Design a binder for this molecule. Structure first.
Ligand SMILES: Nc1nc2c(ncn2[C@@H]2O[C@H](COP(=O)(O)OP(=O)(O)O)[C@@H](O)[C@H]2O)c(=O)[nH]1
Ligand SMILES: [Mg+2]
Lengths: 171, 351
């Protein structure tokens, strides 16, 4: 094990928010519209450097539909961090951030680091969730918040580099 | 006889019809008066073959008028039988594993062309749906988005849509899906509005030369279908990403198969990218307003084995009633979990 740390992160959120494109932009640094929907689980592995260290990140992907929640749960426990993703062009996806949070509690360990992320922010025309409304709810929980665009690589790397530091700042 | 006659129905079928003609003649046995353990049957030339399974041992019965003869199949013989059965849903009472004509490796991003082909055409084993879940309001919530993304990337998707063994051109479905109002940003809970005679013609004509004699029949057919709300319901319902999650039973299995998939993927290819799903294989038949439709939607999610990148085929079948409306609401109610039948099958590369 040449790495210094091995973190298990997990992406959650409704279907189509952009969980995958996010992970792909972070791992392979590319964004496409061909890889179709995600049925079940999936995972990608990327190693970074924080404070002259070597952290092997094992991010997990999941299905946004409610029906998948049950079987998805098995992957919650054992996770160092959870990234709840929502579509800034979709009101619904944000209204549900409530549930995706309540779920983190019912399965993951309370000492787990959380980070809210509003994706698709490049579609300014269709935007409907105000930075402030979210930045609001984000701080009212002590959860770091960021606006990302997997399409343009906006804050995509920062979102993960943040989660990496948040966790390293513990163990 | 002294021991009877020497004539064997099997030898006849063998020299009388092709191998596939024979297999295609088999159907799942649902009848009340079926032999014990009969999971499939076939009738060709006054003979009636019955494929029974008892004590986990498959035996073939040939009923010719009144005489009855049977053959118990060895393990290998049986695994072969399954390996050559029609892509239907049989009650095999166990998820089997078909092996494809190709040696897998752990250095590829997708299943080999042979694995996919094998998958698309192999039969599947039914998972008893008794403790079926109840209709929830979040059902088919993502239907529109799903079909969009799938058909969108159909150019690099093993996805295929058929209507009575008649392949419906993806281009056509691409314009249909659009003229119906399905695009990047559409309301999840929206209700689709049918199309005018012009709209379907605009579509049909953009894919079929009016001066054509060739696909003249396919033309008229699709012209009809595209106007039937029930059809649009079938076509669209078939892509909903959670169509196979229908009961705790199914969940238990599906859960297990995924674990096995993930495990092997962890141990054998941690740094190798692997596509999640290969696509959809939807088959819609007009049942013998308008008419109702029978659907068979199969997903080809990648599945890692001891040999290489395989595929776990999950097939779901239901019945869309003549009076059905294209909406997240209409579908989650006309197609409840109990009206669906899920079956599994695993297709692996070789050593
Ligand atoms: N315009 C835009 N669309 C995005 C962006 N990220 C994702 N999407 C859209 O979201 C669709 C589905 O996203 P995906 O990441 O596959 O979501 P998941 O199923 O929740 O994992 C994509 O194919 C894109 O059309 C983005 O930064 N900008
Ligand atoms: Mg995904």
């Amino acid at each position: 094990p040449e790495y210094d740390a091995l973190f298990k992160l997990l992406l959650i959120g409704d279907s189509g928010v952009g969980k995958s494109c996010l992970l792909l932009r972070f791992a392979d640094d590319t964004y496409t519209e061909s890889y179709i929907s995600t049925i079940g689980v999936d995972f990608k592995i990327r190693t970074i450097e924080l404070d002259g260290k070597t952290i092997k990140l094992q991010i997990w992907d999941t299905a946004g539909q409610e029906r998948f929640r049950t079987i998805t749960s098995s992957y919650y426990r054992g996770a160092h961090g959870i990234i709840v993703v929502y579509d800034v062009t979709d009101q619904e996806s944000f209204n549900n951030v409530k549930q995706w949070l309540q779920e983190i509690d019912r399965y993951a360990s309370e000492n787990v680091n959380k980070l809210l992320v509003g994706n698709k922010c490049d579609l300014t025309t269709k935007k409907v969730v105000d930075y402030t409304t979210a930045k609001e709810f984000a701080d009212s929980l002590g959860i770091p918040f960021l606006e990302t665009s997997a399409k343009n690589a906006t804050n995509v790397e920062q979102s993960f580099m943040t989660m990496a530091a948040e966790i390293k700042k513990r163990m | 006889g002294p021991l009877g006659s020497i004539y064997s129905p099997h030898e006849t079928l063998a020299e009388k019809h092709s191998e596939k003609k024979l297999m295609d003649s088999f159907s799942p046995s649902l009848s009340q008066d079926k032999m014990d353990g009969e999971f499939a049957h076939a009738n060709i030339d006054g003979i009636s073959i019955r494929l029974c399974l008892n004590k986990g041992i498959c035996s073939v019965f040939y009923l010719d008028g009144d005489k009855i003869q049977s053959t118990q199949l060895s393990s290998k013989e049986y695994n072969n039988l399954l390996s050559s059965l029609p892509p239907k849903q049989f009650n095999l009472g166990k998820v089997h594993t078909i092996t494809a004509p190709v040696s897998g490796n752990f250095k590829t991003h997708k299943p080999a062309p042979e694995v996919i082909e094998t998958a698309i055409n192999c039969c599947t084993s039914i998972i008893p749906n008794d403790d079926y879940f109840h209709v929830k309001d979040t059902d088919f919530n993502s239907v529109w988005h799903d079909i969009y993304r799938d058909i969108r990337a159909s150019d690099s998707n093993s996805t295929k849509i058929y209507f009575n063994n008649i392949e419906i051109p993806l281009k056509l479905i691409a314009d249909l899906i659009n003229e119906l109002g399905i695009n990047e940003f559409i309301d999840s809970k929206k209700e689709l509005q049918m199309l005018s005679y012009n709209q379907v013609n605009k579509i049909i004509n953009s894919n079929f030369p009016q001066q054509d004699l060739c696909f003249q029949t396919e033309k008229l057919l699709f012209t009809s279908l595209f106007q039937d709300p029930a059809f649009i319901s079938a076509l669209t319902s078939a892509f909903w990403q959670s169509l196979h999650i229908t009961s705790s039973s199914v969940e238990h299995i599906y859960a297990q198969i995924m674990s096995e998939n993930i495990e092997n993927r962890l141990n054998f290819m941690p740094e190798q990218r692997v596509i999640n799903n290969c696509g959809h294989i939807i088959k819609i038949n007009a049942v013998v307003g308008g008419r109702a439709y029978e659907v068979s939607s199969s997903i080809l999610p990648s599945h890692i084995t001891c040999n290489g990148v395989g595929i776990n085929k999950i097939e779901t079948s239901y019945l869309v009633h003549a009076g059905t409306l294209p909406s997240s609401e209409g579908l989650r109610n006309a197609i409840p979990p109990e009206s669906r039948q899920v079956s599994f099958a695993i297709i692996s590369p070789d050593v």
